[PDB]
C-alpha cells in the first residue's frame, strides 16, 4: 500500500497513537512492507520513544533487522521477551530471528565467557521445531554446552531428520571443522540419544570413537534384546579396538547373560562367518600360487612366492608341492616360508597344530623360530602358545632364543595393556642387543599391544627405551624403529600434551629430534588443529629433509577425510623424498582414477626406491586395470627388488587400528634385505 | 558365427608374449598381424575384438583419418610419432582403425605401408588395420603388410545380433515385446553397441517415464535412430 | 510489445541494475530462453533492440563453414568462444545456425546447445553472457525431449496468433504513410498461415499496388490484396 495514509502516523510520539498505529505496524508487519524499508530516516527516531512499549520494540527490531545492522537489531529482542505458521511468524521468526539470533548467539555467545540468550534461545528452539527447517537451523546454532540440551530437546520426533542429517553433516564437520571439546558432548549426547533410538551400529561407531565399555554393554544386553548375531560379531569385531575387546570380554567374561558374548569376543566368530562363505560363495583360482610359484628363481621369487603363497588368497598346493622348496628358500624366506603355513591358517584353529608341529625342532634355526611365529600368526584368542615359547627365551645373547623371541614376541603381540610379558619384556627392552629386530619387534610389539591407551602412557619400558636411548646414540634404525614403539605406546589419544612432554624430556641432536618428530606424527591423529597446517607448511621447507618425510607423511592420517584437500603439487618438486611424501598419503582406499592417475607419474622414475615403492602402495590401494600395470612394469624392467615387488603386486592387485598400523615397518625398506623377516608379519591383513 | 573365428583371431594375436611358450619354441612367428575388416563394420567386429582382445594385454587406440583430411596434408608424421611412442611401447597392439586429393592419399598410404611394413625393425609389435570396405583399400597393401591371416566375418543375421543379445541381455535387465524381425531385416553396418545403445536408450527412455516396460512404438522410436545412422554415414 | 519485454526484463535486464552483490546474495544468472514459433517477426528485433540499449556485442556460433577455422584452429568450438567471451563480457548470443535428419543435423547444435548451457550452469568465469534457443520445427519437440526444464525460461512466442501481428503491423505502419479509414482487426486478425513474415511481405508487396494505383498513402483494400499475394504461397 501507498505511504500517504500511514507515513506520518510514525512520526508523531502520542501514547494512544501507539496503541494504536503499533498494533497497526503490527498488522503490516505480516509482509514487512511494500519496499526494503526506506522509511528508516524516519523512523529511527523512535529508538528511545515508548505506551505499548514491546511493540515498540518490535517494528524496531523489524525494520533494523529489515534493512541493516549488527548489534542493536536484538537488542530489542533482548529486552523485549516477544509477546502479541503464518507468514508475520515465518517472515519475523524463520529468517529475521534466523540471522537475529545468529548474530546475537555470535555476539553474546562470543563475547562474554545470563538467562535472557537460553530462554529466548528456547524460544527460537519452539519456534523452529514449529517451522521445522531442518539442516539449516541446527547448523547456525551449533556453536551455541547448550548443543547437549538442545539435541535431547530436539530429538523426540525427528529422528531421521536430525539423526542421519545433523549427525552426519555435523559429524563430518564436527571432525573437520568443529574442535574435540564439543565433539565430546557429540559423543556423550549421542550416547544418550543414540542410547535411547534405534539403530545401533551407529553407536557402535560411538564406541569405536568412544572406547566406553557402559556403551557397550548397553549395546549387547539391548541388541541381545533385539534379535542376525554373526554380522554384528564381525563388524563388532572388526570396529573394537584393542582396548575395548579384552574390557569388552572382562564385562562379557563378567556376566555377558548368555556365554555367546564370551564366544564373540575372541578371534572365532568374525572369522566363522567369513571364512566358509568366502569358500563356498567365490573362488580363487591357481594362477598366481601355480603360476607366480611356477616361475621362480634367483632365490628372490622364491622370497616374494612365499609371501604370496602365505596368503590365504583354500589353495594349499604350493605349499604342499613335496619339499625342500623351503631349504632351497633364504634365511628371510625361511622365517616367512616357515610363516606361511601360519599365514595360511588364519582360521583352523585345531589345524594349527598338526601343520606347524611339523617344523617344530626342527634342525634349522629359522624353521623352528619361524614355526613359533607361525603359532603366533594362527590365531589371537588362543593364548596357549605363551609358555612354550616364553620358557626357554631367557639366553640374550646368540642363542636362537632371540629369533624365537622375534617371532615369539611379535607373534604374541599379535596374539594380544598386557603387563606380564611385559615384566618379561623388561630385560629384552633392556637387553641393548646389536640386533635391530629384538628391540624392534619388541618395541613394535609392546607398541602394538598397547596400540589405543587412555591419552598414552609413560611407563618404564617406553621410558627405559628413552633413558636407554639417552645413553648410546648409535644404529640410527634404533633412532627409527624405537619411536614406533614410543608413539604406538602413545596410541589412543586425542588431546595428549604428551608430544611436548617429550618434547621437552628427549630432545637432542637430529636423531631423537627426528624421535621427537616420530611423536608428533603419533600425536596428530586429528582435530581442529589448523595450527598443525599453518605449522605444516611453516616446516614444508625445513633442511632436515627426514622430518619432512615423517611429519608430512602424517598426510594421509590428518586429512584422512577431506579427500580434496590432499591433491597438491607435492610432485612437481625436486625433492623426490616429497614425491615419497605424496606416494605414502596416498593410502589403501578404493583407489580412484585420480590415485593411479598419481601412480603412472610416480611408476615412471629412475630411482629403485621410488620406482620399487610405487607397486606397494599402488597395489595396497587397488583391491581389466590390474594386470596391465604389470605389462607395465614388464616394459620398465624389460631389478630383482622391483620383481619380489611386482609379485607382491601381482598378488596384491586384486578408523581401523590393526589393519593401517603395521604399516610404518614397511615404510622403512630403504635398507638391506632383511626388511623381509618383519615385512611378512604384517597385521593388516582381511 | 565367430567361435572359431575368435579363436583363430585369439590363437592369431594371442600367441606372443601374453602366454609365449608356444610361440618361440616351434620357429613359425609370424609377427605381421591381422587386418580387420567386416561387411557391416562400424565397430562390430571391430569393438567387439577391441573390447574381447583386452583381457591382458596393451591397447593402442588410432581411430578415424580426420585430422589428416581436416588441414593440409601433414602426412606420416603423426605415423612417426605413432612409431616412436609404439617403439617406447613395444609390447603393445597397434590397432589403426576407421581408414577412410588422391594423389597424397596414394603416397602417404606408400610411406604408410612402408613405414608400418617395419623397414627398420624386426618383428616384435602386432599391427592391426581396420575399414569399413576392404575393396576400397589398393590391393597394393595386402602383400607386404598382410601375411599371417585375414579375417572375414560370416554372420548369420538372426544369430550374431541374437546370440550376441541373448549374452549381453542374460546378466542385465530389459523390456518385453524386444521385437527382432525389424532387427535383424533392416540393419546394417552397425555393432554391438548400437542395439546395447538402443536398448540401453530404449530402457532408459522407458525410464524417464520411471518405467520397467517399453513399448514397440518407442522401440521403433529407438530404431529409427539405427534407421538414420546407416544412411547418414 | 510489452508481453515479450515485460518477460525479456528479467532475462536480459536483471543484471543491468544489479550489483556484484547480487552474485553472492541473490540469483546468480539466467541460463537460458527459448521461444517457439516460426521466425517472422522479432527474430533479431528482440534481441538486437534490447542489445542496442545494451550496447553489447553479438557473437554467434552458427557451426558450418568459414566458421570453423576463425574461431580457433581446432576445438569443441565452445571454448574458443568462450575466450572470446572472457575478453568480451557483454555478448548476447542466438542460437540460430524432421525428426529423421533433423534428429542429427539439427542435434549437433542441440548437443552444442547442450554443452554451453553446461557450461554456463557449470562454472560462471564472467558474466552478461546468455544464449537464446531458437527451434520452430519437429526438433522443438525433440527438443522438449531433450530440454531439461529445471534451466529454462518459458516466453510465449505468437507468430501462431494475432496480436504479434497488430503491434508489429503497427509497427511497420508507423514508418509509412497509412489512411484513417482501416481497421487493423480484421486485417490484422484475420492472418493466419506462415509466420509473421507475411505481414512484411504485405507492406512491400503492397507497395506495388500503392504506387500502381498512384496512392499517395496505403489503404485497407491494399492490405487485402496484398494479404491474397501472401496466402498465394506458402
Known sequence: ?686 | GLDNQIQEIKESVELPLTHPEYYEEMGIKPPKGVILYGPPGTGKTLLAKAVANQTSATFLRVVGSELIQKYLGDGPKLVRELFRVAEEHAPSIVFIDEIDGEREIQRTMLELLNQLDGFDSRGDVKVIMATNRIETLDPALIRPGRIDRKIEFPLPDEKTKKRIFQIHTSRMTLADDVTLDDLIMAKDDLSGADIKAICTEAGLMALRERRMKVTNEDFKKSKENVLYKKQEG | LDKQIKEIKEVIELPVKHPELFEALGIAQPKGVLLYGPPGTGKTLLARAVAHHTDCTFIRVSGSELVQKFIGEGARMVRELFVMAREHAPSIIFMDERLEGGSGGDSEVQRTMLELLNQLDGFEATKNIKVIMATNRIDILDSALLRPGRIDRKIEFPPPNEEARLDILKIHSRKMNLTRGINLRKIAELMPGASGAEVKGVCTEAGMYALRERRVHVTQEDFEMAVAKVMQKD
Open chain 1, 1 to 686: 500500500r501507498d505511504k500517504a495514509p500511514v507515513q506520518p502516523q510514525q512520526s508523531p510520539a502520542a501514547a494512544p497513537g501507539g496503541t494504536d498505529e503499533k498494533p497497526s505496524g503490527k498488522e503490516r508487519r505480516d509482509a514487512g512492507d511494500k519496499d526494503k524499508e526506506q522509511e528508516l530516516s524516519e523512523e529511527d527516531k523512535q529508538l528511545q520513544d515508548e505506551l505499548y512499549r514491546p511493540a515498540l520494540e518490535e517494528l524496531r527490531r523489524q525494520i533494523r533487522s529489515s534493512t541493516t545492522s549488527m548489534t542493536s537489531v536484538p537488542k530489542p529482542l533482548k529486552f523485549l521477551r516477544p509477546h502479541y505458521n503464518k507468514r508475520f511468524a515465518a517472515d519475523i521468526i524463520s529468517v529475521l530471528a534466523m540471522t537475529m539470533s545468529g548474530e546475537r548467539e555470535c555476539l553474546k555467545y562470543r563475547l562474554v565467557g545470563a538467562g535472557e540468550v537460553a530462554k529466548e534461545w528456547q524460544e527460537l528452539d519452539d519456534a523452529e521445531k514449529v517451522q521445522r527447517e531442518p539442516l539449516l537451523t541446527l547448523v547456525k546454532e551449533i556453536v551455541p554446552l547448550l548443543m547437549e540440551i538442545e539435541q535431547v530437546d530436539m530429538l523426540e520426533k525427528d529422528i531421521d531428520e536430525n539423526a542421519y542429517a545433523k549427525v552426519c553433516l555435523y559429524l563430518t564437520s564436527c571432525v573437520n571443522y568443529v574442535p574435540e571439546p564439543e565433539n565430546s558432548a557429540l559423543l556423550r549426547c549421542a550416547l544418550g540419544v543414540f542410547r535411547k533410538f534405534s539403530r545401533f551400529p551407529e553407536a557402535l561407531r560411538l564406541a569405536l570413537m568412544l572406547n566406553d565399555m557402559e556403551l557397550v554393554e548397553d549395546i549387547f544386553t539391548s541388541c541381545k534384546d533385539v534379535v542376525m548375531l554373526g554380522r554384528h560379531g564381525v563388524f563388532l569385531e572388526l570396529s573394537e579396538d584393542v582396548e575395548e575387546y579384552e574390557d569388552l570380554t572382562e564385562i562379557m567374561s563378567n556376566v555377558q547373560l548368555n556365554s555367546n558374548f564370551l564366544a564373540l569376543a575372541r578371534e572365532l566368530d568374525i572369522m566363522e562367518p567369513k571364512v566358509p562363505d568366502d569358500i563356498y560363495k567365490t573362488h580363487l583360482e591357481n594362477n598366481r600360487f601355480g603360476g607366480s610359484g611356477s616361475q621362480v628363481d634367483s632365490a628372490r621369487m622364491n622370497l616374494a612366492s612365499s609371501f604370496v603363497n602365505g596368503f590365504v588368497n583354500q589353495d594349499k598346493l604350493l605349499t604342499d608341492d613335496g619339499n625342500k622348496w623351503l631349504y632351497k628358500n633364504k634365511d628371510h624366506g625361511m622365517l616367512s616360508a616357515a610363516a606361511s603355513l601360519g599365514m595360511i591358517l588364519l582360521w583352523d584353529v585345531d589345524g594349527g597344530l598338526t601343520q606347524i608341529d611339523k617344523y617344530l625342532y626342527s634342525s634349522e634355526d629359522y624353521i623352528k623360530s619361524g614355526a613359533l611365529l607361525a603359532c603366533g600368526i594362527v590365531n589371537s584368542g588362543v593364548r596357549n602358545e605363551c609358555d612354550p615359547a616364553l620358557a626357554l627365551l631367557s639366553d640374550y645373547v646368540l642363542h636362537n632364543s632371540n629369533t624365537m623371541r622375534l617371532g615369539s614376541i611379535f607373534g604374541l603381540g599379535l596374539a594380544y595393556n598386557r603387563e606380564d610379558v611385559l615384566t618379561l619384556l623388561l630385560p629384552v627392552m633392556g637387553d641393548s642387543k646389536s640386533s635391530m629386530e629384538v628391540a624392534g619387534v619388541t618395541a613394535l610389539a609392546c607398541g602394538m599391544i598397547a596400540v589405543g591407551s587412555c591419552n598414552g602412557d609413560v611407563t618404564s619400558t617406553i621410558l627405559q627405551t628413552i633413558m636407554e636411548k639417552s645413553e648410546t646414540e648409535l644404529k640410527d634404525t634404533y633412532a627409527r624403529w624405537l619411536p614406533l614403539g614410543l608413539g604406538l605406546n602413545h596410541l589412543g589419544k586425542g588431546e595428549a600434551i604428551e608430544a611436548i612432554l617429550a618434547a621437552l624430556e628427549v630432545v637432542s641432536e637430529p636423531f631423537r629430534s627426528f624421535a621427537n618428530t616420530l611423536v608428533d606424527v603419533c600425536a596428530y591423529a586429528g582435530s581442529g588443529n589448523v595450527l598443525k597446517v599453518q605449522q605444516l607448511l611453516h616446516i614444508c621447507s625445513e633442511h632436515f629433509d627426514s622430518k619432512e618425510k615423517e611429519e608430512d607423511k602424517d598426510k594421509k592420517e590428518k586429512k584422512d577425510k577431506d579427500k580434496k584437500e590432499a591433491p597438491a603439487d607435492m610432485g612437481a618438486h625436486q625433492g623426490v623424498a616429497v614425491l615419497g611424501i605424496a606416494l605414502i598419503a596416498m593410502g589403501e582406499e578404493i583407489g580412484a582414477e585420480m590415485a593411479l592417475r598419481t601412480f603412472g607419474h610416480l611408476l615412471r622414475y629412475g630411482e629403485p626406491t621410488l620406482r620399487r615403492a610405487v607397486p606397494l602402495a599402488l597395489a595396497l590401494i587397488s583391491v581389466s586395470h590390474d594386470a596391465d600395470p604389470e605389462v607395465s612394469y614388464n616394459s620398465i624392467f624389460a631389478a630383482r627388488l622391483a620383481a619380489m615387488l611386482r609379485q607382491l603386486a601381482q598378488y596384491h592387485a586384486k578408523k581401523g587400528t590393526l589393519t593401517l598400523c603395521p604399516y610404518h615397518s614397511d615404510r622403512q625398506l630403504m635398507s638391506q634385505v632383511a626388511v623381509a623377516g618383519l615385512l611378512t608379519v604384517l597385521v593388516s591383513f582381511l
